[PDB]
Amino acid sequence: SRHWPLFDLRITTPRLQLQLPTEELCDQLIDTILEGVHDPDRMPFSVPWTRASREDLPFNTLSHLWQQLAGFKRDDWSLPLAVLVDGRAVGVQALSSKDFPITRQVDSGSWLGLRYQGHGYGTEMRAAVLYFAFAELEAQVATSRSFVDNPASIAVSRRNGYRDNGLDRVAREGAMAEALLFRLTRDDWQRHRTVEVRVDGFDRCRPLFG
Amino acid sequence: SRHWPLFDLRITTPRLQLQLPTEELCDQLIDTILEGVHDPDRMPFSVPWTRASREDLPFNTLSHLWQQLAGFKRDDWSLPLAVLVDGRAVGVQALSSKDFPITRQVDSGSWLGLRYQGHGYGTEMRAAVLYFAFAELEAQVATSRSFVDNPASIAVSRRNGYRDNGLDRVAREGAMAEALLFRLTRDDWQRHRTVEVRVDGFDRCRPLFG
Amino acid sequence: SRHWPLFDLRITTPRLQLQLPTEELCDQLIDTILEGVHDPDRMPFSVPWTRASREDLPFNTLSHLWQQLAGFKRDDWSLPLAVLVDGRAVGVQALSSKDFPITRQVDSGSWLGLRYQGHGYGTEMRAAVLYFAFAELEAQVATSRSFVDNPASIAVSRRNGYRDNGLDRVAREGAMAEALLFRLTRDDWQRHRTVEVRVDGFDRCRPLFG
Amino acid sequence: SRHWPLFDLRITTPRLQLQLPTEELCDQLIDTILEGVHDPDRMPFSVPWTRASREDLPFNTLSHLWQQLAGFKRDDWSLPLAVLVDGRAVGVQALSSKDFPITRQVDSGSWLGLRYQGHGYGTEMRAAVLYFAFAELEAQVATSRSFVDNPASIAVSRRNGYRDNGLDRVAREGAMAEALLFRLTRDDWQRHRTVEVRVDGFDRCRPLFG
Numbered sequence A, B, C, D: 001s002r003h004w005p006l007f008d009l010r011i012t013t014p015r016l017q018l019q020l021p022t023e024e025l026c027d028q029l030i031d032t033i034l035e036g037v038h039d040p041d042r043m044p045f046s047v048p049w050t051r052a053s054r055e056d057l058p059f060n061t062l063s064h065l066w067q068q069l070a071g072f073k074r075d076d077w078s079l080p081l082a083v084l085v086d087g088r089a090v091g092v093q094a095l096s097s098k099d100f101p102i103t104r105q106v107d108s109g110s111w112l113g114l115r116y117q118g119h120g121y122g123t124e125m126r127a128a129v130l131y132f133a134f135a136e137l138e139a140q141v142a143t144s145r146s147f148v149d150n151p152a153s154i155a156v157s158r159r160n161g162y163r164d165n166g167l168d169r170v171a172r173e174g175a176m177a178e179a180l181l182f183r184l185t186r187d188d189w190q191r192h193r194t195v196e197v198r199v200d201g202f203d204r205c206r207p208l209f210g
């Protein structure tokens, strides 16, 4: 939208561009989803949104994304940044926070189209939102969590320098799933960062966050 | 979106086109809002949204339109149709229903940019959604409410054949306001209809309501 | 509770005492419900709560009553008054309002165990809360609604001087039901009232309502 | 209530009795609250309910307890057990769980009136619910969280054998507060349980949880 400055935000790395999904990018993301996100014998997500039928996925996705855009509040926000490789939407690296002005703590969530995995994009797009969070938002801590049987996202966290932060368990599609929690302080983030990241279009967004 | 068939719906009258607001149409509706919606000595809405600052109005509108788009369910839907006069979205004629397949009853809500009022677009645009509800959705009853000090929406209802359906009162900006309720039966709609209305691109949407 | 002054409110008529339901009264109420509330061929309630099994009904009722007691706010309250005959709970005459300090409008809901119907308790217990509403809370309007096939509550309303205030239709257990709405102004109440009503224990409650 | 079997549950230790709060016990808890729960320099609670005026405390507390009583569901429950010392309610040892049939994981919350602190009641009351969770409910994990500056609950956790399970930070009365997370497996519970515990009246409640 041309009426919400958050649409002008750009986070760029040597291979990726991240930005809030426009109407065009949402449709691209649905196209990517329909080509496949994960092997059907896995469930990497808290909410099993990828189980939805081919017919339902498109609107479920539009709905979720619309709701996330619409729910932005200074004290409770979620930013699902579309990840682009040469202008094409390959996945989402979200960043969110509750009471950010007070806590200075963000968490994240991610997915990539299946054919786009295993090329370092997941590490890079994480490095990208962390740069945004620490350098632009002046976050102090970033957290993430991964199911024990989701080693790609565990490795991404370990690569970006997160430390172990305890264990959780949740109901995952009717069965107990163990989860690992990760924590990244600004110190740790600095000591492990290797991706050159640039942010543009943020000046006008500053007062929305604080 | 090209992934939601409701975007293909068009309801046209001799002077108007109504459709679901796309990214661009939402921003056009916002441009119109920022030129003025109603006399400030007046509050024709139960939610005083037009009172928000020039700074807040654009996101508040997006948020709301997005929530409605995201919210479509067979048993609880709201269609916020953009009303186009030239190549500009001048207002919104909404149609909504809870448990529609059972009750077959719809209600409506409306607004037009200040510079567009008084040209008979209010009556024409109500006639358009009413034709859509009765003739395409197969509704049996349509309802509406107006504050007693909003004679233009009262006159639109009367011109379209609606009958008194009782009195209400609500809190409007911390003061009591009286409302008039209106009810249009399918048979009363036939009796009083004068506007030629055409519906296109609904065939693929049909299952969504049924 | 001895910690909430609304438990001291007493509304008394020649045959009835109405009061907020204590632990004991809630239990009497459930006893009464388990003996039966209406012929199974009928559904007089918006929410089909009497359809629940005999196993589930006791907790459904406690949960419901607990929630209404817990939910009291100045701008949003519901008073599920237990109706006592011979000192034992025979039913509930509820009074409720949203934005009462501004609208000064209340509505009501009621039910009696089967063996307690047709004695005029329903009329008398309506009279009881109408008096409390107008004389004690200074309401200006009371409303009520009945399914068209629920003549006993319709007749209680007509008897207390309410006037027809429109038609509605809802889903009721998977089928369409017509509802009649009723409206009583202060003056109409004062023209039709015949029951002697006394209110005790309200002085300390008064500030909770305005 | 005599219509909800959970009211028949008794968890007894050599000094304490825990049970769901009846109307009487809720009033005793409030009495205890009005005498004070913690040093006002401190905020041990994520929700600062002890900050309410003495005027609002009683209804806030009834409202909270009624909501927890009323909100019981197989997949989302909270048991706010009254803690009785010499037959009077002196605090609450809550036990709660979301999706328990699948996760087999519980969490807990506690408070005692000032004058009852420092006599081993907190340690013993935790053991009480832990034995109930592990021995009766067939839990596999129990969790707990304490703010860093809340050494009494930390100590209770350590004494009951919980292990460190990470860090969190939250907004606490407008300021950032660090919290510590504790985890206790069935095995570590077994290794460390000293307190003798009897559970009665659970026999009929069991199906409600499974």
Ligand SMILES: CC(C)(COP(=O)(O)OP(=O)(O)OC[C@H]1O[C@@H](n2cnc3c(N)ncnc32)[C@H](O)[C@@H]1OP(=O)(O)O)[C@@H](O)C(=O)NCCC(=O)NCCSC(=O)CCC(=O)O
Pocket (backbone or CB within 6 Å): A037, A038, A044, A045, A091, A093, A094, A107, A108, A109, A110, A111, A112, A113, A116, A117, A118, A119, A120, A121, A122, A123, A124, A126, A143, A144, A145, A146, A147, A150, A151, A152, A153, A155, A156, A159
């Ligand atoms: C999780 C991601 C985004 C990760 O992206 P990529 O596949 O691009 O990762 P990458 O940058 O190529 O690096 C992946 C790292 O995982 C390793 N790796 C991959 N699969 C492995 C396996 N089966 N066993 C062991 N290691 C494995 C690679 O060697 C590399 O480690 P080295 O650097 O050591 O060589 C993706 O795979 C995906 O979208 N998967 C499906 C959905 C999903 O799982 N979403 C995550 C939910 S959990 C979540 O949302 C929290 C995460 C967050 O905060 O964003």
Ligand SMILES: CC(C)(COP(=O)(O)OP(=O)(O)OC[C@H]1O[C@@H](n2cnc3c(N)ncnc32)[C@H](O)[C@@H]1OP(=O)(O)O)[C@@H](O)C(=O)NCCC(=O)NCCSC(=O)CCC(=O)O
Pocket (backbone or CB within 6 Å): B037, B038, B044, B045, B091, B107, B108, B109, B110, B111, B112, B113, B116, B117, B118, B119, B120, B121, B122, B123, B124, B126, B143, B144, B145, B146, B147, B150, B151, B152, B153, B155, B156, B159
């Ligand atoms: C309500 C509308 C959409 C009405 O449309 P217009 O202003 O285009 O009116 P119109 O089509 O030109 O004419 C319709 C009837 O209104 C009469 N009319 C117009 N302006 C009037 C006025 N100021 N005083 C008295 N009557 C007036 C015309 O003579 C005509 O009557 P004849 O046919 O006898 O010649 C608009 O006024 C508006 O947007 N106002 C600000 C927002 C608002 O009020 N929204 C509605 C809130 S209440 C609501 O949402 C429920 C309505 C619904 O269900 O859609």
Ligand SMILES: CC(C)(COP(=O)(O)OP(=O)(O)OC[C@H]1O[C@@H](n2cnc3c(N)ncnc32)[C@H](O)[C@@H]1OP(=O)(O)O)[C@@H](O)C(=O)NCCC(=O)NCCSC(=O)CCC(=O)O
Pocket (backbone or CB within 6 Å): C037, C038, C044, C045, C094, C107, C108, C109, C110, C111, C112, C113, C116, C117, C118, C119, C120, C121, C122, C123, C124, C143, C144, C145, C146, C147, C150, C151, C152, C153, C155, C156, C159
């Ligand atoms: C509705 C009530 C509370 C009504 O109480 P009573 O039975 O004590 O009523 P009453 O004072 O004895 O007077 C009942 C009136 O019903 C008439 N009546 C009874 N059955 C009738 C029938 N089948 N056909 C025609 N008339 C009938 C009687 O002649 C009398 O009218 P005359 O004066 O002309 O002789 C109760 O019947 C009940 O609990 N019913 C089942 C649950 C229910 O329907 N709840 C109401 C939901 S609707 C609602 O909640 C809104 C009402 C409210 O605001 O509280």
Ligand SMILES: CC(C)(COP(=O)(O)OP(=O)(O)OC[C@H]1O[C@@H](n2cnc3c(N)ncnc32)[C@H](O)[C@@H]1OP(=O)(O)O)[C@@H](O)C(=O)NCCC(=O)NCCSC(=O)CCC(=O)O
Pocket (backbone or CB within 6 Å): D037, D038, D044, D045, D091, D107, D108, D109, D110, D111, D112, D113, D116, D117, D118, D119, D120, D121, D122, D123, D124, D143, D144, D145, D146, D147, D150, D151, D152, D153, D155, D156
């Ligand atoms: C937390 C409790 C229930 C703790 O119960 P008690 O007071 O009976 O404690 P206890 O069993 O007698 O053991 C207390 C032990 O705490 C330590 N201790 C107590 N106060 C301390 C202080 N100021 N500094 C350092 N240590 C301290 C000592 O080791 C002491 O053992 P010695 O006697 O050998 O010296 C209570 O203090 C309380 O209600 N406090 C106010 C509200 C509160 O903080 N609630 C908990 C919120 S956190 C939560 O709810 C999660 C915990 C849960 O799962 O229930």
